[model samples]
Target chain A: AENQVELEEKTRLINQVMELQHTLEDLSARVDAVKEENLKLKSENQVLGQYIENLMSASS
Target chain B: VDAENQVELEEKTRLINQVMELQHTLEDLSARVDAVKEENLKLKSENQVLGQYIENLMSAS
Candidate 1:
């Protein structure tokens, strides 16, 4: 029957959506981690830049 | 069969809509990851440049 076919198709689509949801969650977490690391790198670079400026003044 | 079949068709429609929404969200997340990774690479490059400048300054001193 067509109903039987439709039911099966619906089940497959539901499963696909579930898998995509899991993938989205994982990707979101990875983005967060990368952003956090980026922030840390930026801050460290800032401090290093300041130190370099200080050294320049002291040497001159 | 008509009534039962109708219910199944409605459920299938709902499921299809959900699948489309999820697909869009996945696409958006994928794009965001790419952007974040690009930013990460830029930051790392800047950090390397800063480190080199510090070394140069200290050596000159």
Candidate 2:
């Protein structure tokens, strides 16, 4: 009877570990995607800045 | 038997709390990411308007 209880407890903990792993994996992927998007936006802003600088120089 | 189960439960509970903390951190980062995206969109719109304004000024000069 005690062995049975031990086995059941182990199983429950294992299941929790699996669930946590899956959640972590999903969250990590989302974070990676967000970082990629942030990089793209910053580069785009830099490009716009240069264009604006050129336009100003021409007007001056 | 109770002692055995208690140890396992304590360790598992600790792990769960750790994961919960990480989830909160990721949530905070996700909020920041959203704010950045909103700002990027606003800047793009403002840049477009500025470009048009400059074009008109160039033509007038």
Candidate 3:
């Protein structure tokens, strides 16, 4: 992905995050942000799905 | 301290956000740039997922 800005950061931090540390606030925080958004999308999708289900149920 | 760094990042993010927000608080973030950020998160998550798999494999060893 476009996380190139971070991974490309001196290549040092990236090295640290990869070397079993599995962490870095910048990337980690960014990841959390992404995750929250992803969950929101999932929730929204489910709601829309439910709406469709309701509409179908109503029509049928 | 590590905690301090987190604050630093937050402040930096806020400052950068203000620069943009102050300019066009009424407008949306650039879709193209947002796409790039979203893609970045995807890649990072992919890396983390792979890392977890590798860690689990090693742990089971």
Compose the digit string of candidate 1's lDDT tens values, residues B1-61.
6898788778878878888998898888787777788889999998999899888877874
Every candidate's DockQ is 0.68, 0.26, 0.02
The residue-level lDDT of candidate 3 at A42 comes to 54
Question: In terms of lDDT, which candidate is stronger, 1 or 3?
Answer: 1
Alpha carbon RMSD to native, model 3: 20.8
Q: Model 2 RMSD to the real structure?
A: 4.4
Chain A TM value for model 2: 0.83
Q: List pairs with backbone clashes in candidate 3.
A: A2-B40, A3-B40
lDDT of 3 by residue, B1-61 (tens): 7897687577556555544443352232233346656766675565556555545545664
Best candidate, lDDT-wise? 1
Question: Candidate 1: which pairs clash?
Answer: none
**Per-residue lDDT over A17-50 for candidate 3, one digit per residue giving the tens place of the 0 to 100 score:** 3442232324446556766676765565555556
Best by DockQ: 1
True contacts kept of 3: 0.00
lDDT of each: 0.85, 0.71, 0.53
Question: Which 10 residues in a row give candidate 3 chain B its minimum summed lDDT?
Answer: B22-31
